Design an enzyme around this catalytic site. Structure first.
Site, PDB file in Angstrom:
ATOM      1  N   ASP A 128       0.839  -1.174   0.000  1.00  0.00           N
ATOM      2  CA  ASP A 128       0.000   0.000   0.000  1.00  0.00           C
ATOM      3  C   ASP A 128       0.883   1.236   0.000  1.00  0.00           C
ATOM      4  O   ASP A 128       1.805   1.339   0.810  1.00  0.00           O
ATOM      5  CB  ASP A 128      -0.897  -0.026   1.236  1.00  0.00           C
ATOM      6  CG  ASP A 128      -1.986   1.028   1.190  1.00  0.00           C
ATOM      7  OD1 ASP A 128      -2.351   1.480   0.080  1.00  0.00           O
ATOM      8  OD2 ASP A 128      -2.484   1.392   2.274  1.00  0.00           O
ATOM      9  N   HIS A 135      -3.845  13.946   0.889  1.00  0.00           N
ATOM     10  CA  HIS A 135      -4.093  13.006   1.976  1.00  0.00           C
ATOM     11  C   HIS A 135      -2.941  13.062   2.981  1.00  0.00           C
ATOM     12  O   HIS A 135      -3.166  13.228   4.182  1.00  0.00           O
ATOM     13  CB  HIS A 135      -4.256  11.580   1.441  1.00  0.00           C
ATOM     14  CG  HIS A 135      -4.344  10.538   2.515  1.00  0.00           C
ATOM     15  ND1 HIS A 135      -5.447  10.396   3.329  1.00  0.00           N
ATOM     16  CD2 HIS A 135      -3.451   9.606   2.930  1.00  0.00           C
ATOM     17  CE1 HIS A 135      -5.232   9.428   4.200  1.00  0.00           C
ATOM     18  NE2 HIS A 135      -4.028   8.932   3.979  1.00  0.00           N
ATOM     19  N   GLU A 201     -10.902   3.863   3.732  1.00  0.00           N
ATOM     20  CA  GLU A 201      -9.906   4.612   2.974  1.00  0.00           C
ATOM     21  C   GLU A 201     -10.112   4.325   1.503  1.00  0.00           C
ATOM     22  O   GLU A 201      -9.971   3.181   1.061  1.00  0.00           O
ATOM     23  CB  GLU A 201      -8.491   4.238   3.387  1.00  0.00           C
ATOM     24  CG  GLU A 201      -8.050   4.893   4.683  1.00  0.00           C
ATOM     25  CD  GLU A 201      -6.571   4.687   4.965  1.00  0.00           C
ATOM     26  OE1 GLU A 201      -6.003   3.730   4.414  1.00  0.00           O
ATOM     27  OE2 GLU A 201      -5.973   5.472   5.735  1.00  0.00           O
ATOM     28  N   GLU A 203      -9.291   3.959  -2.127  1.00  0.00           N
ATOM     29  CA  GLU A 203      -8.081   3.690  -2.902  1.00  0.00           C
ATOM     30  C   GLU A 203      -8.378   2.916  -4.178  1.00  0.00           C
ATOM     31  O   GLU A 203      -9.484   2.403  -4.389  1.00  0.00           O
ATOM     32  CB  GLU A 203      -7.087   2.848  -2.087  1.00  0.00           C
ATOM     33  CG  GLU A 203      -6.738   3.422  -0.733  1.00  0.00           C
ATOM     34  CD  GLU A 203      -5.530   2.773  -0.114  1.00  0.00           C
ATOM     35  OE1 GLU A 203      -4.565   2.463  -0.838  1.00  0.00           O
ATOM     36  OE2 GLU A 203      -5.539   2.582   1.108  1.00  0.00           O
ATOM     37  N   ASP A 235      -9.397   0.316   2.153  1.00  0.00           N
ATOM     38  CA  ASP A 235      -8.445  -0.115   3.174  1.00  0.00           C
ATOM     39  C   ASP A 235      -9.003   0.202   4.566  1.00  0.00           C
ATOM     40  O   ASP A 235      -8.650   1.222   5.158  1.00  0.00           O
ATOM     41  CB  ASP A 235      -7.096   0.589   2.962  1.00  0.00           C
ATOM     42  CG  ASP A 235      -6.008   0.092   3.913  1.00  0.00           C
ATOM     43  OD1 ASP A 235      -6.172  -0.966   4.550  1.00  0.00           O
ATOM     44  OD2 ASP A 235      -4.958   0.752   4.017  1.00  0.00           O
ATOM     45  N   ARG A 239      -8.040   3.403  13.416  1.00  0.00           N
ATOM     46  CA  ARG A 239      -7.145   4.518  13.756  1.00  0.00           C
ATOM     47  C   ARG A 239      -6.546   4.534  15.163  1.00  0.00           C
ATOM     48  O   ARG A 239      -5.373   4.889  15.339  1.00  0.00           O
ATOM     49  CB  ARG A 239      -7.864   5.845  13.503  1.00  0.00           C
ATOM     50  CG  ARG A 239      -8.529   5.947  12.134  1.00  0.00           C
ATOM     51  CD  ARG A 239      -7.599   6.543  11.120  1.00  0.00           C
ATOM     52  NE  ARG A 239      -8.199   6.608   9.793  1.00  0.00           N
ATOM     53  CZ  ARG A 239      -7.520   6.423   8.668  1.00  0.00           C
ATOM     54  NH1 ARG A 239      -6.219   6.166   8.717  1.00  0.00           N
ATOM     55  NH2 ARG A 239      -8.143   6.460   7.499  1.00  0.00           N
ATOM     56  N   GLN A 242      -4.006   1.726  15.483  1.00  0.00           N
ATOM     57  CA  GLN A 242      -2.810   2.091  14.738  1.00  0.00           C
ATOM     58  C   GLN A 242      -1.937   3.116  15.448  1.00  0.00           C
ATOM     59  O   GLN A 242      -0.717   2.958  15.515  1.00  0.00           O
ATOM     60  CB  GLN A 242      -3.152   2.618  13.346  1.00  0.00           C
ATOM     61  CG  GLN A 242      -1.897   2.926  12.531  1.00  0.00           C
ATOM     62  CD  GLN A 242      -2.167   3.673  11.243  1.00  0.00           C
ATOM     63  OE1 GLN A 242      -3.130   3.392  10.533  1.00  0.00           O
ATOM     64  NE2 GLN A 242      -1.295   4.612  10.921  1.00  0.00           N
ATOM     65  N   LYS A 255      -4.561  -2.089  10.230  1.00  0.00           N
ATOM     66  CA  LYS A 255      -4.929  -2.256   8.822  1.00  0.00           C
ATOM     67  C   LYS A 255      -5.284  -3.693   8.422  1.00  0.00           C
ATOM     68  O   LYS A 255      -6.150  -3.912   7.578  1.00  0.00           O
ATOM     69  CB  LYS A 255      -3.754  -1.832   7.927  1.00  0.00           C
ATOM     70  CG  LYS A 255      -3.293  -0.408   8.079  1.00  0.00           C
ATOM     71  CD  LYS A 255      -4.325   0.535   7.500  1.00  0.00           C
ATOM     72  CE  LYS A 255      -3.803   1.955   7.469  1.00  0.00           C
ATOM     73  NZ  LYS A 255      -4.809   2.886   6.895  1.00  0.00           N
ATOM     74  N   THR A 259      -9.401  -5.626   4.210  1.00  0.00           N
ATOM     75  CA  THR A 259      -9.179  -4.707   3.097  1.00  0.00           C
ATOM     76  C   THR A 259     -10.074  -5.281   2.001  1.00  0.00           C
ATOM     77  O   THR A 259     -10.002  -6.469   1.723  1.00  0.00           O
ATOM     78  CB  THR A 259      -7.692  -4.751   2.648  1.00  0.00           C
ATOM     79  OG1 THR A 259      -6.857  -4.348   3.739  1.00  0.00           O
ATOM     80  CG2 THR A 259      -7.438  -3.822   1.463  1.00  0.00           C
ATOM     81  N   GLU A 366     -10.420  12.462   7.571  1.00  0.00           N
ATOM     82  CA  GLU A 366     -10.272  13.762   6.923  1.00  0.00           C
ATOM     83  C   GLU A 366     -11.612  14.485   6.788  1.00  0.00           C
ATOM     84  O   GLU A 366     -11.694  15.687   7.016  1.00  0.00           O
ATOM     85  CB  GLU A 366      -9.647  13.600   5.536  1.00  0.00           C
ATOM     86  CG  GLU A 366      -8.228  13.082   5.535  1.00  0.00           C
ATOM     87  CD  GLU A 366      -7.800  12.650   4.149  1.00  0.00           C
ATOM     88  OE1 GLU A 366      -7.228  13.479   3.415  1.00  0.00           O
ATOM     89  OE2 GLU A 366      -8.059  11.484   3.781  1.00  0.00           O
TER      90      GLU A 366
END
Ligand SMILES: O=C(O)/C=C/C(=O)O
Ligand SMILES: O=C(O)/C=C/C(=O)O
Ligand SMILES: [Ca+2]
Ligand SMILES: [Ca+2]
Ligand code: NI
Ligand code: NI
Ligand code: NI
Ligand code: NI
Ligand code: NI
EC number: 3.7.1.2
Lengths: 418, 416
Positions: A128, A135, A201, A203, A235, A239, A242, A255, A259, A366
């Site tokens: 990844d 971002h 996420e 992607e 993904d 948070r 992590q 993560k 996924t 975000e």
């Protein structure tokens, strides 16, 4: 445009200009097999494999009998282009071979409504990247302050990390909120419990074709010969888990619990009409990462969220793949510069896609700006992060003159923790 | 003892019996074998002899080109296979000893076999579990006061590694090219790695594994550990230093990682278990176990460069210098629901003891290039030079026998 003998709605993701590859099974036959989407149908390649009489595929017709696309991906460009040419001719409204073979058509086509999609390939390794400048800047501002948003190496190399291959699941697979270690209170010991900051996420990812020998880099001028096609990806991220674990070795359990990728692999040939020149890079990249070949794509991406009590899904993000700073060519070249051996079926993800407009940010971290702003999801509901029962659906389309190239969907529903 | 002669200092007595994948000139098809003395017992040849309840209906796992399916069968199968093997090989058993024709087809010499990777590794994870190693590295990069980051003593830190570049012992490793930033006030440069290093580690293979979304409780972790191998996690320090913040080791590790070919089963290692190190602060309940699962395994690392007649031992350490156990690593790895699969490889992290002679990397042995390592013959080293060969070996000393791992070797080739 062009047309197939198979009727295709003008807004369909699957016109004759697309022709993505996927692995499916049906209620009548449980064996996973290779198919191509066309309209609302699926063309079974294991049934028509004997029609591939060209030089590249004649000796390799067995690749269409496989349960995964790996062998086909490994064949390389010549075989890919030949397969595509044969399919476009075979599905053409002017061609009689398949169109008028009532018996064969019956065995070769199946409604997408009757199919169960499977992962398109056995993914040997998954990587990844972190290639969206907005971002990276947004996340940097939230955790380090605007002054130290982008770390010194970001503008010099496409930063990335090895992901977990086993937990990559196909669209539709339920994702359970993860349990783990977190440290909310800096002045107290860590605690064990359910993740509180579950996020998605946005992607895109591409599959590797032939690949390289162990110890041999892939020159950037040849990089394009190793990219098979693309899929959408979510993904899923925890948070809080992590934040506590990731220093200094990187994202791990935050993560790997899941996924998701869409099941239809859209070939690069289908995306070429939507290529645009690459973003200007300053500072200028080192020679090994420098290439003039345009390889940035205009792909409109949408993320919708539907809560367990909601009747209609709300669009919470509208972005575009052309907002990436590092191209797939640069990502693949950098990934093999040390001699690392990329293999057919490997998956390389772009990184979360965020544009400059707040409505184009690719994650709820975000969109809600670290939970300080509520995301209006309509009908009096709001969100900061994902709640149990929430369903996230990602879609993407390329708009051409009278047709669209779509990716189907990349969906997943959040299940309560244990 | 076996009817097969076994030298007293052999790594492969009847008490060991490791599994591996080999081939020969006669038969190039990779197949499963067990090491005994200086021979290899071909399990595909004797597959019909496994008549027990756990294996009678799964004899086909021995016809595979990899150990994956056998690993996936679980402990009942592993234990039954071992009991059968020890019975068939015992000097007092007639079955295999006396069937001359079968005997001639079942055994082959190690000296004429080519070893292959023992399994298809779906995912590879590398931990950072040796306290002295983490402290040493921390002191060099962050300084004494911040050597160990806050989370280290609370969870077994680790990262996803690159599976494709894991190669079997004997494979040459080419010095990698990449980006480096030797001068922090100047832009990065592209070139050949200058700080090439090795990392002494051990790793274990996962057996059955868990379903997606279902964690493996610590009380059941022992049921998913198949066996171990030696490992050398080749590292390009200068490439890593520039790339790793904040997402972790990437190209500085993926150019190559070597493992030994013989998988020593956990059952052969049990006699060498010792009490687990005292953990303070004590771990959260999900990581707590009373069962001893720390092992007394002597590890040795030798280096031989060009122009050198004899290889020099540059490191002597032991696997008991690990802070987090394999049970804790496995449990932590699945706590979030991540699905471990048969054949997955989980490495320990660089093994370093408190003694300077037991540091598991040249970065530590040369203290970031400040101390020259004397390798004899008037030669010294800080980091690896082209032509250098590193050989790792490991042994468990029992009463009257040794359980050895064979070797984990690799020679450095010049950059392209
Ligand atoms: O702890 C670190 O920052 C780095 C460790 C390593 O490079 O091994
Ligand atoms: O740049 C960081 O530190 C973290 C990024 C992320 O978690 O995505
Ligand atoms: Ca991501
Ligand atoms: Ca390592
Ligand atoms: Ni036209
Ligand atoms: Ni659509
Ligand atoms: Ni700079
Ligand atoms: Ni070309
Ligand atoms: Ni020995």
């Amino acid at each position: 445009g062009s047309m197939s003998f198979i009727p295709v709605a003008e807004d369909s993701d699957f016109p004759i200009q697309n022709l993505p590859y996927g692995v499916f099974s049906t209620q009548s036959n449980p064996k996973p097999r290779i198919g191509v989407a066309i309209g609302d149908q699926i063309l079974d390649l294991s049934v028509i494999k004997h029609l591939f009489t060209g030089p590249a595929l004649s000796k390799h017709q067995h690749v269409f009998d496989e349960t995964t696309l790996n062998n086909f991906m490994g064949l390389g460009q010549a075989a890919w282009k030949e397969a595509r040419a044969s399919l476009q001719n075979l599905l053409s409204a002017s061609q009689a071979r398949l169109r008028d073979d009532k018996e064969l058509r019956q065995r070769a086509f199946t409604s997408q409504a009757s199919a169960t999609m499977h992962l398109p390939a056995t993914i040997g390794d998954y990587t990844d990247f972190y290639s969206s400048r907005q971002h990276a800047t947004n996340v940097g501002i939230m955790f380090r302050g605007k002054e130290n948003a982008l770390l010194p190496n970001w503008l010099h190399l496409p930063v990335g990390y090895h992901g977990r291959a086993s937990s990559i699941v196909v669209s539709g697979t339920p994702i359970r909120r993860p349990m783990g270690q977190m440290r909310p209170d800096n002045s107290k010991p860590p605690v064990y419990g359910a993740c509180r900051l579950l996020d998605m996420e946005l992607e895109m990812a591409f599959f590797v074709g032939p690949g390289n020998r162990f110890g041999e880099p892939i020159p950037i001028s040849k990089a394009h010969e190793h990219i098979f096609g693309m899929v959408l990806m979510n993904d899923w991220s925890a948070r809080d888990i992590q934040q506590w674990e990731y220093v200094p070795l990187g994202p791990f359990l935050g993560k790997s619990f899941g996924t998701t990728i869409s099941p239809w692999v859209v070939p690069m040939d289908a995306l070429m009409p939507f290529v645009v020149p690459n973003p200007k890079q300053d500072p200028k990249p080192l020679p090994y990462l420098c290439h003039s070949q345009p390889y940035t794509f205009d792909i409109n991406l949408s993320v919708s969220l539907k809560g367990e009590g909601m009747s209609q899904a709300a669009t919470i993000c509208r972005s575009n793949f052309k907002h990436m700073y590092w191209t797939m060519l640069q990502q693949l070249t950098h990934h093999s510069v040390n001699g690392c051996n990329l293999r057919p079926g490997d998956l390389l993800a772009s990184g979360t896609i965020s544009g400059s407009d707040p409505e184009s940010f690719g994650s709820m971290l975000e969109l809600s700006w670290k939970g300080t702003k509520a995301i209006d999801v309509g009908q009096g509901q709001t969100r900061t992060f994902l709640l149990d029962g929430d369903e996230v659906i990602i879609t993407g389309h390329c708009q051409g003159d009278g047709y669209r190239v779509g990716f189907g969907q990349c969906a997943g529903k959040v299940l309560p923790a244990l």
